[PDB]
């Protein structure tokens, strides 16, 4: 009477686990390993999963999709990987009904990842329990295909790409059809995700495939407009894989069929991103990622924002988001006794600005090093390299997406945030998922303060489209973003009325969107 029991889904009955919480009757129903699509075929679109007899025991996480290990030496996962997981919070009087539903999409550069995430202190990163119970929402996590098996493409109908995006869409569609049986409101689905998962969230809101399926969305440190998201030259990367695995490269149709019958582990390990040193910046080796296929992604994403006109939207970034790519591109920023020089930074900047030639390199170098005259310290110079990568990879694309979403909004509300703290401790995921409460020995009181506020905003937003209005109190009134106010919430360990700010790095936003674009293209 206060828990779900066997749940009737379209494929048949599903039985999960009930976990009693606290002393006074609360609990949480946990389902792991519900199939939402058939066992996958290499480089083919996902298909419906056949129904089953009896009661499916949804007791354990299922295998992730076949992917390279972090050493890039071998693989793990399996072709049979399109499974999802559900947390349903339960009160002490009766079973929950009409709850907001939040669907998480993990990141990992479209190359790695699973629905449970990394395990640390006996706790999976994307364990939805804390969000679900603290926010009174349902949380869904799931697997999608990554790497070459998720995104290999010829740029044409022989191998159209975007298999992993279709996987995500199939999980969303399954949730819309089935989640009411678990106590969810299918008209109130919020997607949220980080990095590649935030770009995926963005792409799902822009795809006509999701018409009528999505109510709201949250992009964390990634949008469809980020430069690492759309592969402009997929045939080049498909040919690189073909050559490594022994497929001919003269005919696209012959190459595509050969790739489809190659050992999927060989496809997965065909290319390895060199650690160091690289000839180009890290951004250059972003390979197997979404493409404009004229189908799932019908056009350049900048042109698709009418599809999100009635999808409420949060988008934000982390203060130091670019530091991973910056550390690869300029290792000196790690070692305290190693200098970054004007010459090193010019070189990096010139790699990013090649299409506008010498002039574009200089104008960019000049604007980012303007402060180096008064402050030539290595602290300021290394911060400049990180801010540069953060701007071009995350912040500027996020600000353009916010402006595009606002300009196309009908009923949709738009919100912006900047997360500033103090894996790495500066990252937003662990606070969104409430890890400071799930493994409190690894965290300080101020961390639980931050996580409490983020879960309040996120789940208020899921419930109502208004991060300030819902089951939870918030520390700062989060004002909706407009072109006029260009406001963002700065999320930190102590928030108050001044945490609502405006015009984040607008001189740099204006440089990239007006000044740099006004420069003549060079060939």
The residues that are catalytic are 195, 321, 425
What residues does 20 pair with on adjacent strands? 27
Residues 177-196, mask of contacts with Zn ion (x by CB under 5 A): -----------------x--
Task: Give kind and range of the element (H or E) at residue 317.
Answer: strand 312-318
Q: What is the Cα–Cα distance from 183 to 89, expressed in whole angstroms? A: 9
Does the footprint of Zn ion cover residue 447 (CB under 5 A)?
yes
Minimal distance, residue 223 CB to Zn ion, in Å: 13
On the question of a cis peptide bond just before residue 422, with omega within 30 degrees of 0, the verdict is: yes
* Interactions with Zn ion, residue window 362-421 (CB under 5 A): none
For Zn ion, the nearest residue by Cβ is 284
Q: Which is nearer to Zn ion, 284 or 362 (CB)?
A: 284
End-to-end CA gap in the chain? 70
Query: Where does 213-315 have alpha helices with state H?
Result: 234-245, 252-260, 264-269
Minimal distance, residue 202 CB to Zn ion, in Å: 15
Q: Which is nearer to Zn ion, 352 or 512 (CB)?
A: 352
Single residue of 2, 18, 72, 78 touching Zn ion by CB under 5 A? 78
* Interactions with Zn ion, residue window 291-320 (CB under 5 A): none
φ, ψ at 247 (rounded to 5°): -95, 145
Does the footprint of Zn ion cover residue 35 (CB under 5 A)?
yes
Q: At what angle do helices 357-368 and 378-390 cross, to 10 degrees?
A: 130
Residues 140-179, mask of contacts with Zn ion (x by CB under 5 A): ----------------------------------------
Q: Which is nearer to Zn ion, 194 or 293 (CB)?
A: 194
| CA-based nearest residue to 467, from 216, 285, 282 | 216
Residue 112 C-beta-side C-alpha neighbours within 13 Å: 13
* Interactions with Zn ion, residue window 346-365 (CB under 5 A): 351
Q: Which is nearer to Zn ion, 168 or 221 (CB)?
A: 221
- 193 contacts 105 by C-beta, under 8 angstroms: yes
* Interactions with Zn ion, residue window 416-435 (CB under 5 A): 422, 427
Single residue of 19, 177, 265, 284 touching Zn ion by CB under 5 A? 284
Place of tokens 């349903």: 88
Q: What is the Cα–Cα distance from 6 to 31, expressed in whole angstroms? A: 11
> How many residues interact with Zn ion (rule CB under 5 A)?
12
Does the footprint of Zn ion cover residue 499 (CB under 5 A)?
no
Q: Which is nearer to Zn ion, 76 or 372 (CB)?
A: 76
Kind of pairing between the strands at 500-502 and 487-491: antiparallel
Does the footprint of Zn ion cover residue 221 (CB under 5 A)?
yes
Residue 100 C-beta-side C-alpha neighbours within 13 Å: 25
Q: Which is nearer to Zn ion, 123 or 254 (CB)?
A: 123
* Interactions with Zn ion, residue window 473-492 (CB under 5 A): 479
Q: What is the Cα–Cα distance from 58 to 33, expressed in whole angstroms? A: 5
Contact residues: Zn ion, CB under 5 A = 35, 78, 98, 194, 209, 221, 284, 351, 422, 427, 447, 479
């Amino acid at each position: 009477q206060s828990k779900l029991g066997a749940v009737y889904t379209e494929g048949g009955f599903v039985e999960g686990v009930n976990k009693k919480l606290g002393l006074l009757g609360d609990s949480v129903d946990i389902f792991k390993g519900i199939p939402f699509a058939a066992p996958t075929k290499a480089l083919e679109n996902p298909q419906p999963h056949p129904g089953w007899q009896g009661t499916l025991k949804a007791k354990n996480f299922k295998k992730r999709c076949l992917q390279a290990t972090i050493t890039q030496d071998s693989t793990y996962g399996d072709e049979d990987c399109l499974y999802l997981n559900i947390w349903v919070p339960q009160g002490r009087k009766q079973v929950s009904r009409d709850l907001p539903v939040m669907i998480w999409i993990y990141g990992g550069a479209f190359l790695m990842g699973s629905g449970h995430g990394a395990n640390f202190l006996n706790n999976y990163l994307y364990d939805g329990e804390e969000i679900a119970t603290r926010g009174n929402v349902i949380v869904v996590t799931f697997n999608y295909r990554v790497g070459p098996l998720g995104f290999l493409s010829t740029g044409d109908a022989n191998l159209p790409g975007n298999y992993g995006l279709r996987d995500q869409h199939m999980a969303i569609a399954w949730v819309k059809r089935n989640i009411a049986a678990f106590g969810g409101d299918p008209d109130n689905i919020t997607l949220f995700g980080e990095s590649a998962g935030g770009a995926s969230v963005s792409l799902q809101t822009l795809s006509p495939y999701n018409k009528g399926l999505i109510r709201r969305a949250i992009s964390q440190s990634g949008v469809a407009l980020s430069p690492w998201v759309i592969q402009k030259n997929p045939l080049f990367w498909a040919k690189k894989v073909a050559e490594k695995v022994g497929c001919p490269v003269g005919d696209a149709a012959r190459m595509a069929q050969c790739l489809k019958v190659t050992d999927p582990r060989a496809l997965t390990l065909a290319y390895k991103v060199p650690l160091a040193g690289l000839e180009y910046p890290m951004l250059h080796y972003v390979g197997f990622v979404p493409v404009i296929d004229g189908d799932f992604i019908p056009d350049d994403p900048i042109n698709l924002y009418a599809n999100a006109a009635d999808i409420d939207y949060i988008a934000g970034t982390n203060n130091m988001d670019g530091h991973i790519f910056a550390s690869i591109d300029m290792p000196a920023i790690n070692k305290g006794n190693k200098k970054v020089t004007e010459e090193d930074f010019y070189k990096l900047v010139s790699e990013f600005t090649i299409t506008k030639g010498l002039r574009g390199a200089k104008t960019t170098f000049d604007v980012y090093t303007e402060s180096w005259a008064q402050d030539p310290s290595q602290e300021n110079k290394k911060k400049t390299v990180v801010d540069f990568e953060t701007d071009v990879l995350f912040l500027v694309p996020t600000e353009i997406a916010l402006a595009q979403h606002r300009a196309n909004a009908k009923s949709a509300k738009t919100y912006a945030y900047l997360f500033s703290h103090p894996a790495d401790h500066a990252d937003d995921i662990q606070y969104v998922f409430g890890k400071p409460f799930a493994t409190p020995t690894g965290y300080r009181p101020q961390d639980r303060t931050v996580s409490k506020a983020m879960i309040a905003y996120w789940t208020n937003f899921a419930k109502t489209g208004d991060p300030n209005m819902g089951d939870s109190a918030v520390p700062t009134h989060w004002e909706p973003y407009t072109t006029e106010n260009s406001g963002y919430l700065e999320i930190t360990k102590k928030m108050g009325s001044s945490s609502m700010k405006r015009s984040l790095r607008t001189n740099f936003l204006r440089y990239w969107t007006l000044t740099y674009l006004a420069l003549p293209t060079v060939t």
